[PDB]
Design a protein around this ligand. Structure first.
Ligand SMILES: Nc1ncnc2c1ncn2[C@@H]1O[C@H](COP(=O)(O)OP(=O)(O)NP(=O)(O)O)[C@@H](O)[C@H]1O
Ligand SMILES: Nc1ncnc2c1ncn2[C@@H]1O[C@H](COP(=O)(O)OP(=O)(O)NP(=O)(O)O)[C@@H](O)[C@H]1O
Ligand SMILES: [Mg+2]
Ligand SMILES: [Mg+2]
Ligand SMILES: [Mg+2]
Ligand SMILES: [Mg+2]
Lengths: 270, 270
């Protein structure tokens, strides 16, 4: 019989592709030695051939998709004014407000990309022709409880279009083209949302890949937006979790503990 | 005569390529209208053709260079334990320690990439063949005074090699190949450093592009490293400042105020 500590250690070393059962009755050291050997070989192969990090590679793939479809690539601050949170209509007694990492007294780590993209839409509307199409990929931060679907440090893609063409049909068509490109099956379900009102949730089984919005909405006035728009946000670690059939999203995160879903802690357990 | 407010506004709208002088005696509105028209056209052209963000594009170019030369692409946490700072030998009464953005009580925004790369070197040495070559590009954070060479939110590349081949000659040769690839002239100057001891500073005129280190050093013991190593760190916004002849590094930063060095604030000044 394996202890809980031994089972947890084997789970860290097990990968989705492995045809190995921890409930097979084999001794711990036998299972551990096989898995350590497989993971070392996996890392050696990555190092010998591709050498690309899954999160970096997916960002680059996504960037090419959106650039090629006419969207401007934005890189905006990660450390943002706390005032942008309140201006998103997030009251400081709300659950989301309690998820914010504060920095100093007046700043925070962004929990979402919307504020910066709202400002870019307003500014670019003075220079660029209709429709204005932008996107951003980068780190976002939320305090979360320990779970297999959430990270405190994650990576979000968000895109937005403003002006003509800002229909639910076009929004769903962009989402469909994007997730087809990635080879990810999904469905769309309507839900309510305290920030945006009603959303379209992009679901893979019970896992939310994205929330999307058809504007205009009452919040727009606070950002100086008065045109129709559509937009969506996606978690890159969730996309990787689906693509690679990871059991826990930690396998896809910025991490010291995993490289492309392979444990970096390859010591023997005693 | 132009007021200081008017001169500052024209400086924001002026780009290095412009053959326009603010000291020419022309009225403010004439200079402002010409510059606004040039910047709008610049943004329109970016939107019509390349659509790539300078910081994103440079990260991708750098990533390809290092991956193709056998270095593993790392993406590690930006929000790190405050204990890693002390373990770098940064005492809490030192000037660098005062530059750290603290988060919660026990975390901070990373001011450097070295701690995470030290841990990756230690772990990967159990799996990968000699020499171990890794790199990371991403956000770093330091409190700074207002100046044209420093950002509080910047982007660092750091690479390291550990094992064989870890000579000053090989380090300089990698730096030279890299900066040749980018088309940036430089010189190397020795300096002292409280964290690493002696460094090699990679200079473009009076601007430090990088600091580099030939190990081993006494700090290595604290990270479980006992082999020779070489490494260097570079600021991407500084590389862009040199490449594009920006007068202030803010033009190259993650920003709401500039897109590829072009002002996003294209209103009229009254
Ligand atoms: N903590 C997190 N970890 C990983 N991905 C996240 C996290 N929070 C949000 N995302 C991703 O970002 C997308 C847009 O954010 P948002 O719609 O606000 O998330 P959410 O409604 O809080 N999702 P959930 O907490 O699973 O019910 C989500 O659909 C996820 O793909
Ligand atoms: N505040 C900053 N803004 C932009 N780039 C930075 C900043 N701090 C460091 N870098 C870059 O990161 C590289 C490695 O960091 P490090 O050697 O610690 O910088 P440094 O010695 O503090 N440079 P300096 O402050 O100009 O004397 C530097 O050579 C810069 O290219
Ligand atoms: Mg949530
Ligand atoms: Mg949602
Ligand atoms: Mg400094
Ligand atoms: Mg230095």
């Amino acid at each position: 019989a394996l202890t809980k500590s031994q089972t947890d250690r084997l789970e860290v070393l097990l990968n989705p592709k492995d045809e190995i059962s921890l409930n097979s009755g084999k001794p711990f050291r036998e299972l551990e030695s096989e898995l350590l050997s497989r993971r070392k070989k996996d890392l050696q192969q990555i190092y010998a051939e591709e050498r690309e990090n899954y999160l970096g590679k997916l960002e680059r793939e996504i960037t090419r998709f959106f650039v090629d479809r006419g969207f401007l690539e934005i890189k905006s601050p990660i450390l943002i004014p706390l005032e942008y949170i309140e201006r998103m209509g997030i009251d400081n007694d709300t659950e989301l407000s309690k998820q914010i990492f504060r920095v100093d007294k007046n700043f925070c780590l962004r929990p979402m990309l919307a504020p910066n993209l709202y400002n870019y839409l307003r500014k670019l509307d003075r220079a660029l022709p209709d429709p204005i199409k932008i996107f951003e990929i980068g780190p976002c931060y939320r305090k979360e409880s320990d779970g297999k679907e959430h990270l405190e440090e994650f990576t979000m893609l968000a895109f937005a279009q403003m002006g003509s063409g800002c229909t639910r049909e076009n929004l769903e068509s962009i989402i469909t083209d994007f997730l087809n490109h990635l080879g990810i099956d999904f469905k769309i379900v309507g839900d309510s949302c305290m920030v945006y009102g009603d959303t379209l949730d992009v679901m893979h089984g019970d896992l939310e890949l994205s929330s999307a919005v058809v504007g205009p909405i009452p919040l727009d006035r606070e950002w100086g937006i008065d045109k129709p728009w559509i937009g969506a946000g996606f978690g890159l670690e969730r996309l990787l979790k689906v693509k690679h059939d990871f059991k826990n999203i930690k396998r896809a995160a910025r991490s010291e503990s995993y490289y492309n879903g392979i444990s970096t802690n390859l010591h023997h357990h005693h």
